Amino acid sequence: TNILDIKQGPKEPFQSYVDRFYKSLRAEQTDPAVKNWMTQTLLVQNANPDCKLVLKGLGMNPTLEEMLTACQGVGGPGQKARLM
Amino acid sequence: TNILDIKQGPKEPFQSYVDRFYKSLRAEQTDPAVKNWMTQTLLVQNANPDCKLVLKGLGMNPTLEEMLTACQGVGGPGQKARLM
């Protein structure tokens, strides 16, 4: 049940947060159907405001790769490399 | 060739920019293959920095609906409604 407390830090890169989220998820997952709901709903809800904004803009059922791509650099100065 | 000069304003909503972009595009489009390239490359390049960031995070070949969804409210205080 610790997965409900896994929350992204204000300056933590999304990749680091995802890594910690899936480590606790893979250990204590109850059902394969519950695990799917955690990866597409709970993961977004516990992200920081900067990444939570980007994730909610991704529409329905975003894959993990699409989330990692969209959140790369988000929350710091690194995302500005997209603009050049 | 005016389509190359259609650029999103710093405070213009993405929906307004898309509307102006497609109006000029549908009039002067040369090839159906050129039109496809303008909707997925030129549209992103001429967006403002706020929306250009979000669009480049969408990965490969984003549909117009996915772009409109991701950019809703981006560039103003309206996007914060996602976080609550």
From TrEMBL, chains A, B:
Q: Which residues form the Retroviral nucleocapsid Gag protein p24 C-terminal domain?
A: 1-70
Instruction: Write out the annotated subcellular location.
Output: Host cytoplasm; Host nucleus; Virion
| Domain of life of the organism encoding this protein | Viruses
Record's protein name: Gag protein
Shown part of the complete sequence: 282 to 365 of 409
